[PDB]
């Protein structure tokens, strides 16, 4: 039972775009579906809702066709178009199945969200640089490797290690903007026995550029 | 007492095999008759359609062949009633109820042909009337007919066979076996004293009748509304309100039907020639309205799924309701053979939907669909006017198959029957029998 | 529209504390819901109808209130309860959300583990050099990081970023990144970053020599 | 009597407002009581589960804490009955039927507490018994209780309030309002003479009762079987056959329940100490079987959806059926408070499914699903044994929501009630009342 | 509409295997039994087998252990047929059908167009296309019949149109004949003498199995 | 299993005329269905449960039968009734179709328009020589073609192919191809194709000479 949203990324002010949300694991029909967004580091804001036959379609007080919510029950997909896009439209957009218990409706299940960036810049894929200890293998019980993910736009990137086999011992740092590009780094801590004795690689994905980079971390000899 | 009861308990539910088997043949026959009646009505509605084709150019000639085709069919039915079987007028449920009280004769040698062929004429001409009237009376008469042919004796057999024939008759008209049996248990049985009507026998006849129906009808449902949404607890109070509206309208609509029986009688004084000519004009109005605004005329089953899906504007719904209240009274009160039961279904739906459309706009927080109120109103005129709410509710369930709406259906139904009581209304079928029995002692 | 105001925007607590947070409505509401949003995660229906628990919400959680005053209570908070909590109403349309209560965890001390990394071969080929310092799993959050190049002190070109608090062990982590051209990096030899944290009077310092 | 009739017709359906309103409060109370009873039973079945956890290592100690935990709960219930309210034993539908005949007392000051707390013990220990017994008697008693509190007078009020309380009781046990009303109209009303029971009032109480249930239960259904296939006309004869099997088994099963009431009595002679100890052993057998073979024990609602989906082997179904016939008799015939109604649903389903599995293999041309026969058999033991087929059918419909099977459901039900008649069987509830009324006189 | 679109059929070598697919659109594909039927060249309909909506029951014609494998993906709304150890006997047009019933004796409710399976060790080979012109001293009559010969291709099918489908009257295309592992056919076009050779007559030929599209201008001989 | 045998395995019949095909089972069968197939087209459910028409099937169509014999019928056959008609049973398992009944139009006899073609220069260059003969638009379908090389009968290297009955005009057609090596083709001079139809005793010889 999942909600997968996409179509996020870069749009130029005044322009428009179309987010899709692909539902699955339930009978998508006969569910009212909804959209909510969250501006960076802010709180949740309801966009609209559409009934299972699109008979009723409700919206937050927007202007003209500011928002257009739509559903294709034949594909179990939910849609949202935004027009005349302005900086306030820069946010994380969530799809959500709706439901109730006594009657006052709630937002039953939520998707991962997709991210909309309103800017005039270019979509640039990241460079990924491997971070291994310098020629000084001062072995402790554990070792710390990282990767450096630099010069991408827009947010976000996702980082994993051995495709999420290495889960424990991982931190990824919030990105930082400079010269209208983003940089972040990911850290992983594994036993000194497990490396270089075995392979550690970081897998970076940047949906907006449809780009994945998987860089192997090698010692410096 | 304790002696007598203990002997009775030990002997409970031992219907005589003779009655059980004869219940089976009664139901089989009623099914077939109901099927045949149904096929006939449709065949005539067709002929009428194919006629408007040969004359679809001359809009005046068009409107004329619609009126006349239905005027003739109408008159034929009125005449057949006035001439050979006057108690085959109107519904006939009040008559069968009479017979179960042992206060009215079951003239099966007369009614079977009159009602059957009579009804073909009124129904086939596209009048606002239901098949259940005919099928219930026809089915009762069939019940008497096999009691007589096989000369079975006793009160049980007379009451049982008569009851199953009527139940099999409702069942076969709506493809609703459960409603068939409930209608007898709740509405048509003698209301004020014990009876020997065997329930097991009524069940058997309903089965057989329903099987006959399915043999000639499967793959297609009378009313398909799909699956609607559920109803949240905090939404229930809205159904109660709707029921209260049906409850005050119920009795008021009863007055009109009864009063309109009176008003229309004055027109022909009782004279079989003025009468037949009156029915010919009402029957022509209906076949005409049938072309220029179908929703104001006919059985009304066609517009139910459309109404439930919110596909009518509010304007249209009001129009339709008012129109159809008019054409419903004119047709039933006129004395033409045929039910008022089905047309009350259409009135309920239309009214339901309008209330639903209003609820939808006042409470977007409830996430309503107009259809759920349509489904709840469908059986509500039945419950307010004829006061058989359990039958109405179970009939609508059987026809619309939205069990998740059971609570709001029951609430609208109970509210209807409660407000009809408290505003001094009466069960319609009982008020018709009453007035018929009151002319029989004056 | 109904305005929902949630009590502390931000509150600290120690596992074993009974914790209470508040949602106030500008006008009467009822049967309000609560979402939990852990860092990096979607909101997750947590409490609904004022006081009903969604399946798999541990019993330590409870909801209550009515009129214009609703609360969510954790009867002895646990470290894994670190998140931002949102309240929500749909007794009136359109529906609306609280601004959120961020719940932070108070735990015992933990000292940074420091790691230093020289610009990679790959990166040097592009004409840039990023010296990167990881400071992992410390507590509390306040920490200072000090960049010495060849003994001197660099304050231009340093970028720091903290993770949020960890959901299981409540620690924080941080990275500091020194950005220089392939040239500037070379006109020097010794790079050392220094971490100063309450768990030590003497700074943890790590370094490497370009030679 | 024409002029009398004319009078009565014009006065039809005018239930006194006092009775209507009181019907409402009766139903509200019954709903709440049924909810509470339901929550309590579940809470005890849990405790019992959490106990087998603290001792899941020592398989012998495990089997022992299962038996004792349920033995104690059982005895507690048997005792509460024998000591303060002997007519709160077994189902209680036969008793409420009695009361409607005006042949048995409604001792609400005694039964409410006994049946409620008594049932928690038998049901909560995991015995093969239904909630409806308790909820119907409890609900009837509640009907008398508010008749007395508010000192309403007349035959109508006594019969009405008593009837709605019992209907609201069946409704709240199955979340089946329609079955609640039909049960009164077909089964529980005085069978041989007119009554002043108001139908509109019974309806009101069932509504209220059902609303109470929904307030504490929504989003989860007692039995979810999904949507099954349809039934082709040329398939119907197969349902008739199944009905005929239920029809010959019905009465035979009735004999066993009655005869087993006799056989089990001889064991304790009537002695409240041997009796309580007997129920403690049956109750321990059940809590034990509950761990080592759940399908042989408990209410049986859990195994219905599983049986319907064809997920049991034929071997298992036979096992389960036989087992559950045994544990069903031992529990109900023993005199423990609780219904036999629900357990007969489980027996019907299991039997249906086995017939279905055979039909599936003999006629691949019919394209059958075992489940449609399971659905048709579900209310068939009800129809053959207690002889309330319309109530059975409408109950099953309400619980399984497969309306497209209405014809085969009705055919199996009718066939069952027809073959039970023709093989000389009797409505069970009436045979239990009869025998109870025959002892309340043979003692003179 | 209700649409059934079977695919996956092509040329396969004896003893090979293949997986046919049927795409259902425009009706609730859950709830229906689905079926495969096949028609071998100039022959009758034969039933392969059927699958119920939950794949709990799957029946096959009286034939062989793991020969056929029917399965369905109700979520993908598609039905599947795997064939094994394929013999020439399996060379057939394969039909996907939705099942239903009236009184309860089941019939084949709605069918797809079909996919052809050709089981053969002969190799794929493009056609040589040659013009059929009337002879040098041809009897210039009112109507003039022209043609084209489509020679040495495998497998079927090819398609022939004239003037890109504008010439539609008076065209026929003869069925292909197979010899020595290769197919030959020809197409006839009859036009009025005022059309040809004053205007151009062209046969366009396609054989997608070999990715062959080719036009042949027909021009008078000598 | 149950074998179903259709009767006029093939048959022709004039429009506005009464058509009747048959179906017969090795054992007793109930509620037979009937599908109509045009070439290039998916089988269409035509008649089911022995007598009931599918939505759209014109009323001139009707079925009947019991036990071991059944039948289809068209009171007034139309042109578009030309198709193959398959009967089917599922009273027994497993279900079996009938071998089929081909239904073709009947019309006035017509003579072939015969046409002969020399090997194109394109094929000769490659060393093969095909001599093609079209017998176009004739009725009925039975026909004979004879090849002569320099007035002498030739049988080897000849393949003929019939079209299916035409749509517009309801005629037939049939091509005849004589294949030789470029060498054998060059030894000779006169190539004749002689169509012996029904509509005459005197064949319609077409021919050419290379010279
Ligand atoms: C024939 C009998 C069967 C019909 C039964 C249906 C009864 C309809 C009730 C539905 O709504 C209930 O009625 C209350 C009104 O009494 C409403 O207000 C209740 O809650 C409101 C706030 O939500 C407040 O106005 C009040 O505290 C309280 O009256 C509230 O929606 C709910 O409790
Ligand atoms: C037979 C036993 C029960 C009989 C009575 C049935 C229940 C009581 C009547 C309806 O219940 C409540 O009445 C309130 C008035 O006191 C309404 O107030 C309010 O509640 C609404 C909730 O949507 C708001 O929109 C409006 O301000 C206003 O209607 C409320 O709607 C409604 O739930
Ligand atoms: C857990 C505490 C009990 C539950 C709550 C009880 C509330 C108050 C009622 C207590 O019992 C009362 O007293 C008598 C019983 O003790 C009853 O009369 C009865 O008293 C006699 C008992 O022997 C009978 O013979 C008479 O017929 C009959 O009127 C009386 O009506 C009943 O109300
Ligand atoms: C306010 C808190 C609760 C306090 C309860 C107060 C109301 C109790 C009313 C009880 O009424 C007495 O007991 C019986 C009902 O209990 C009735 O007749 C009783 O006595 C008869 C003796 O013939 C027998 O029928 C039965 O014991 C019984 O009907 C009758 O009303 C009266 O004798
Ligand atoms: C309480 C009421 C009981 C409900 C009764 C339900 C209907 C009766 C059983 C179902 O009907 C069956 O249908 C068969 C097909 O499936 C018939 O086959 C018939 O087949 C041939 C007719 O086609 C005849 O030659 C055969 O005698 C006959 O078995 C058969 O007769 C009949 O039993
Ligand atoms: C009020 C109505 C009367 C009561 C209902 C009577 C029900 C049975 C009557 C006839 O139907 C039965 O079932 C099949 C016809 O449906 C007959 O043969 C059956 O035999 C085979 C058994 O293997 C099956 O495969 C076939 O369906 C079928 O031909 C069978 O001989 C016949 O007795
Ligand atoms: O009218 C012909 C019709 O009814 C006849 O039955 C009698 C009936 O027995 C009596 O009650 C009488 O009052 O009315 C009928 C006509 O005299 C015939 O016996 C019957 O066969 C026939 O169908
Ligand atoms: O076909 C007519 C039918 O009539 C007879 O039935 C009598 C019935 O017995 C009496 O109640 C009488 O008053 O009216 C009925 C008229 O039908 C016979 O029972 C029967 O043989 C005869 O066929
Ligand atoms: O011998 C008892 C008696 O029982 C049956 O009557 C039923 C009747 O069908 C219903 O009205 C039900 O509510 O009450 C009775 C239950 O016994 C038989 O119909 C009758 O012949 C038989 O004598
Ligand atoms: Cl009437
Ligand atoms: Cl009526
Ligand atoms: Cl009992
Ligand atoms: Cl009665
Ligand atoms: Cl019980």
Taken in order of first residue, the domains within chain E and their CATH numbers are 1-121 (2.60.40.10), 122-220 (2.60.40.10)
Phi and psi, residue B57, nearest 5°: -90, -50
If residue B65 lies in a helix (H) or strand (E), which one and from where to where? helix B59-84
Indicate contact of C with E: 3+ CB pairs under 8 A.
no
- Residues of chain D contacting A102 with CB distance shorter than 8 Å: 218
Residue E53 CA: distances (Å) to CA of D355, D373, E23, E34: 21, 18, 15, 8
CA distance F45 to F54: 7
Write the Ramachandran bin of E85: left for phi over 0, alpha for psi from -120 to 50, otherwise beta: left
Which chain F residues contact residue E173 at CB under 8 A? Answer: 163
Q: How many CB atoms lie within 10 A of CB F167?
A: 12
Residues 6+ apart with CB under 8 A from E8: E18, E19, E20, E21, E115
Quick one: CA dihedral A189, A193, A196, A202, positive or negative? negative
Would an 8 Å CB–CB cutoff place B235 in contact with chain A?
Answer: yes
Q: How many Å apart are CA C173 and CA C139, to the nearest integer?
A: 9
The C-alpha atoms of residue D244 and residue D351 are separated, in whole angstroms, by: 13
- Per-position b or e across C100-117, b if 16+ CB within 10 A of its CB: bbbbebeeeebbbbbbbb
Strands F44-48 and F52-53, bridge-based pairing = antiparallel
Sheet order of strands, A17-24 included? A2-6, A17-24, A77-82, A67-72
- Spatial neighbors of B273 by CB under 8 A, at least 6 apart, are none
The answer to whether F29 touches F89, Cβ cutoff 8 Å, is yes
Beta strand residue intervals within B226-274, DSSP E: none
Distance to chain F for D237, nearest Cα, Å: 15
What residues are paired with A106 via a beta bridge? A99
Q: Is B326 in the pocket of ligand 9 (CB under 6 A)?
A: no
| Residues with Cβ within 8 Å of residue D2, at least 6 apart in sequence | B103, B437, B440, B441
Instruction: Please indicate the experimental technique that yielded this structure.
Output: X-ray
How far apart (Å, rounded) are the C-alpha atoms in residues D161 and B411?
20
Subunit contact A106:C89, Cβ cutoff 8 A = no
What's the half-sphere exposure (Cβ side, CA atoms, 13 Å) at E73? 9
Q: Is the beta carbon of D113 within 6 A of some atom in ligand 3?
A: yes
Atom of ligand 3 nearest to the CA of D108: 4
The reply to whether ligand 3 has any atom less than 6 angstroms from the CB of D110 is no
CB F136 within 8 A of CB E172: yes
Interface of C with A in 79-118 (CB under 8 A): 86, 88-91, 93-100, 113, 115-118
CATH 2.60.40.10 fits F108-210, yes or no: yes
Q: Which residue's CA is the closest to the ligand 9 atom numbered 17?
A: B12
User: What is the whole-number distance in angstroms between the Cα of residue D135 and the centre of ligand 1?
Assistant: 26
Residues 92-111 of E with CB under 8 A from B: 102-103
CB distance B13 to ligand 9 below 6 Å: yes
Return all residues near D161 (Cβ < 8 A) that are at least 6 apart.
D19, D22, D23, D26, D143, D144, D146, D147, D152, D201
From E92, E68, E89, select the one nearest E80 (Cα to Cα).
Answer: E68
User: Going by C-beta distance under 8 Å and a sequence separation of 6 or more, which residues neighbour residue F8?
Assistant: F21, F22, F101
Chain Cα centroid distance, residue B413? 17
Q: Does A102 touch chain C (CB under 8 A)?
A: yes
What is the fold, at CATH topology level, of the domain defined by C1-107?
A: Immunoglobulin-like (2.60.40)
Which C-chain residues 121-180 have CB contacts (< 8 A) with chain A? 121-123, 126, 130, 132, 134, 136, 159, 161-163, 173-175, 177
Instruction: Give the best residue of D226, D230, D232 to mutate against chain E (max E CB count within 10 A).
Output: D232
Q: Does the CB atom of residue D363 touch ligand 6 within 6 A? A: yes
- The protein residue whose alpha carbon is closest to atom 7 in ligand 1 is B237
How many CB atoms are located within 10 Å of the residue A20 CB? 18
* Residues C51, C114: Cα–Cα separation, whole Å: 45
Token look-up 């709001």 returns B408
- Give the pair of three-digit tokens for residue C31: 């049967």
Beta bridge partners of E141: none
**CATH number of the B1-442 domain:** 1.10.3080.10
Tracing tokens 């073959």 back to the chain, one arrives at D419
Mutation test residue for ligand 3: of D105, D109, D148, D151, the one with most atoms within 8 Å of CB: D109
Mode of pairing for the β-strands spanning C10-13 and C101-105: parallel
Instruction: Show Cβ contacts of residue A28 under 8 Å, excluding neighbours closer than 6 positions.
Output: A73, A76
CA dihedral (B410, B416, B422, B426) positive or negative: negative
CATH class of the domain at D1-444: mainly alpha
CB contact under 8 A, A100 and B310: no
* DSSP codes joined into one string, B6-29: HHHHTT-S---HHHHHHHHHHHHH
Residues of F in contact with E108 (CB under 8 A): 33, 35, 43, 45, 88
The H or E element containing residue D83 is helix D59-84
The answer to whether E177 faces chain F, any CB pair under 8 Å, is yes
Residue whose CA is closest, atom 5 of ligand 6? Answer: D237
The single-letter DSSP state of residue F94 is S
> Using omega within 30 degrees of 0 as the cis cutoff, is the peptide bond preceding A98 cis?
no
Pocket test for ligand 8, best of B107, B141, B146, B148 (most atoms within 8 A of CB): B148
Asked if A23 and A44 count as a contact pair (C-beta separation under 8 A), the reply is no
d(CA A111, CA E205): 52
Q: Which CA distances in Å does B121 have to B283, B297, B333, D132, E92?
A: 9, 15, 17, 52, 57
d(CA D144, CA B351): 40
Length in residues, chain C: 211
DSSP state of D382: I
Please enumerate in sequence order all residues whose Cβ is within 8 A of that of F6, keeping only pairs 6 or more positions apart, or say none.
F21, F22, F23, F24, F85, F86, F87, F98, F99, F100, F101
Determine the Cα–Cα distance for residues B24 and D414; give it in Å rounded to an integer: 12
Q: Are B392 and B218 in contact (CB under 8 A)?
A: no
Annotated binding-site residues of B for chloride read 91, 340-341, 429
Report which protein residue has its CA nearest ligand 3's atom 4.
D109
To the question of whether residue D341 is assigned a binding role by annotation, the answer is: yes
What is the number of other CB atoms lying within 10 angstroms of the CB of residue D193?
11
Does residue A156 have a cis bond before it (omega within 30 degrees)? yes
- Tell me which residue in E107, E136, E175 faces F161 most closely, judged by beta carbons: E175
Provide CB contacts within 8 A for E72, sequence distance 6+. E34, E51, E55, E78, E79, E80
> Which residues in chain B are closer than 8 Å to D211, comparing Cβ atoms?
233, 236, 407
Q: How many C-beta neighbours within 10 Å does residue E20 have?
A: 21
- Do residues B211 and B30 make contact, with C-beta atoms less than 8 angstroms apart? no
Of B227, B233, B360, which is closest to A103 when you measure between CB atoms?
Answer: B233
Question: Ligand 12: distance of its center to the CA of D36 in Å?
Answer: 22
Instruction: Please tell me the residue having the least CA distance from ligand 6 atom 14.
Output: D237
3-class secondary structure, C2: coil
CA distance linking residue D106 with residue D143, whole number of Å: 9
Of all ligands present, the nearest one to the C-alpha of D94 is 12
Rounded to an integer, what is the distance from CA A128 to the centroid of its chain? 18
Residue E13 CA, chain-centre distance (Å), reads: 18
- Resolution in Å, one decimal, please: 2.4
Both tokens of residue C164?
Answer: 């949020």
Pairing of strands C190-196, C204-209: antiparallel
Domain parsing of chain D, residue ranges? 1-444
Q: Which of E47, E104, E107, E109 is the best substitution to test chain D (most D C-beta atoms within 10 A)? A: E104
Q: Which mutation among B232, B233, B235, B237 tests ligand 2's pocket best, with the greatest number of atoms within 8 A of CB?
A: B237
Angular region, B298: left φ>0, alpha ψ -120 to 50, beta rest: left
Residue with token string 């027994």: F92
Q: Is F131 helix (H, G, I), strand (E, B) or coil?
A: strand
- For residue A219, the SS3 value is coil
Asked if residue F111 lies in contact with residue F96, where contact means CB atoms within 8 angstroms, the answer is no
Strand ranges (E), D343-436: none
| DSSP code per residue over B348-406 | HHHHHHHHHHHHHHH-GGGT--HHHHHHHHHTHHIIIII--HHHHHHHHHHHH--GGGH
Please name the residue whose Cα sits nearest to atom 22 of ligand 4: D105
Q: Which of residues 81-100 of F touch D (CB under 8 A)?
A: 90-95
Cβ contacts of F171 within 8 Å, gap of 6 or more: F107, F110, F136, F137, F138, F139, F165
Cβ pair A93, A79 in contact under 8 A: no
Query: Distance of CA E2 to CAs A55, B114, D40, E104, Å?
Result: 24, 46, 53, 22
């Amino acid at each position: 039972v999942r909600l997968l949203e996409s179509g996020g990324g870069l749009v130029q002010p005044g322009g428009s775009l179309k987010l899709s949300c692909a539902a699955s694991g339930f009978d998508y029909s006969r569910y009212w579906m909804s959209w909510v967004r969250q501006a960076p580091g802010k709180g949740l804001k309801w966009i609209g809702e559409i009934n299972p036959v699109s008979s009723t379609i409700n919206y937050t007080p927007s202007l003209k066709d500011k928002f257009i919510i739509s559903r294709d029950n034949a594909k179990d997909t939910l849609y949202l178009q935004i027009s005349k896009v302005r900086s306030e439209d820069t946010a994380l957009y969530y799809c959500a199945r709706l439901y109730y218990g006594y009657g006052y409706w709630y937002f039953d299940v939520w998707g991962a969200g997709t991210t909309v960036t309103v800017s005039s810049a270019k979509t640039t894929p990241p460079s990924v640089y491997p971070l291994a200890p310098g020629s000084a293998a001062a072995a402790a019980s554990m070792v710390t490797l990282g990767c450096l993910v630099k010069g991408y736009f827009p947010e976000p990137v996702t980082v994993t290690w051995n495709s999420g086999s290495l889960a424990a011992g991982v931190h990824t740092f919030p990105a930082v903007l400079q010269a209208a590009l983003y940089t972040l780094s990911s850290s992983v801590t594994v036993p000194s026995s497990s490396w270089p004795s075995e392979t550690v690689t970081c897998n970076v994905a940047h949906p907006a550029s449809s780009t994945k980079v998987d860089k192997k971390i090698v010692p410096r000899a | 007492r304790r002696r007598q009861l203990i002997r009775q308990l030990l002997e409970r539910d031992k219907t005589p095999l003779a009655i059980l088997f004869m219940a089976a043949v009664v139901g089989t026959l009623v099914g077939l008759a109901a099927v045949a009646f149904d096929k006939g009505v449709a065949w005539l509605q067709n002929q009428r359609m194919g006629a408007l084709v040969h004359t679809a150019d001359n809009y005046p000639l068009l409107l004329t062949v619609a009126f006349l085709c239905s005027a003739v069919l109408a008159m034929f039915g009125y005449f057949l009633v006035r001439k050979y079987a006057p108690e085959a007028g109107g519904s006939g449920i009040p008559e069968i109820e009479g017979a179960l009280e042992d206060q009215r004769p079951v003239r099966w040698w007369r009614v079977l042909p009159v009602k059957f062929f009579g009804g073909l004429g009124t129904l086939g001409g596209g009048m606002v009337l239901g098949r259940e009237g005919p099928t219930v009376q026809i089915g009762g008469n069939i019940g008497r007919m096999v009691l007589d042919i096989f000369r079975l004796k006793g009160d049980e057999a007379r009451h049982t066979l008569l009851a199953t024939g009527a139940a099999a008759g409702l069942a076969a008209a709506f493809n609703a076996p459960l409603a068939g049996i409930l209608f007898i248990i709740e509405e048509m049985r003698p209301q004020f004293r014990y009876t020997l009507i065997s329930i097991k026998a009524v069940f058997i006849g309903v089965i057989m009748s329903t099987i006959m129906y399915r043999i000639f009808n499967h793959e297609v449902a009378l009313i398909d509304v799909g699956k609607l949404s559920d109803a949240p607890l905090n939404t229930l109070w809205l159904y109660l309100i709707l029921g209260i509206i049906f409850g005050i309208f119920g009795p008021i609509f009863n007055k009109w039907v009864l009063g309109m029986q009176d008003l229309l009688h004055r027109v022909h004084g009782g004279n079989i020639t003025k009468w037949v000519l009156m029915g010919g004009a009402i029957g022509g109005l209906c076949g005409l309205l049938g072309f220029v605004a179908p929703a104001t005329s006919g059985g009304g089953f066609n517009l139910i799924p459309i109404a439930t899906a919110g596909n009518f504007s509010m304007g249209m719904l009001v129009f339709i309701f008012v129109a159809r209240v008019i054409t419903t009274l004119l047709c039933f009160s006129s004395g033409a053979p045929g039910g008022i039961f089905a047309p009350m279904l259409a009135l309920g739906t239309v009214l339901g939907t309008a209330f639903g459309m209003v609820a939808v706009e006042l409470f977007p927080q409830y996430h309503l669909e107009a259809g759920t109120f349509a489904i709840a109103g469908m059986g509500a005129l039945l419950a307010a006017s004829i006061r058989a709410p359990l039958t109405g509710i179970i009939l609508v369930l059987e026809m619309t198959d939205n069990y998740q709406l059971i609570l709001p259906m029951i609430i609208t139904g109970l509210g209807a029957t409660l407000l009809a009581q408290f505003t001094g209304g009466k069960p319609l079928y009982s008020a018709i029998l009453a007035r018929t029995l009151a002319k029989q002692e004056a | 529209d109904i305005v929902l105001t949630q009590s502390p925007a931000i509150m600290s607590a120690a596992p074993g504390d009974k914790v209470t947070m508040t949602c106030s409505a500008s006008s009467s509401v009822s049967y309000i819901h609560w979402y939990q949003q852990k860092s990096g995660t979607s909101p997750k229906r947590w409490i609904y109808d004022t006081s009903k628990l969604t399946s798999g919400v541990p019993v330590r959680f409870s909801g209550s209130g009515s009129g214009t005053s609703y609360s969510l209570t954790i009867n002895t908070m646990e470290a894994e309860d670190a998140a931002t909590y949102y309240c929500q109403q749909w007794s009136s349309h359109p529906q609306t959300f609280g601004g959120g209560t961020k719940l932070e965890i108070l735990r015992a001390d933990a000292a940074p583990t420091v790691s230093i990394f020289p610009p990679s071969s790959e990166q040097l080929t592009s004409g840039g050099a990023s010296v990167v310092c990881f400071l992992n799993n410390f507590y509390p959050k306040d920490i200072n990081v000090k960049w010495k190049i060849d003994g001197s002190e660099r304050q231009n070109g340093v970028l720091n970023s903290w993770t949020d608090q960890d959901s299981k062990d409540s620690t924080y982590s941080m990275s500091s990144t020194l950005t220089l051209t392939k040239d500037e990096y070379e006109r020097h030899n010794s790079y050392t970053c220094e971490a100063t944290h309450k768990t030590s009077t003497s700074p943890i310092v790590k370094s490497f020599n370009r030679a």
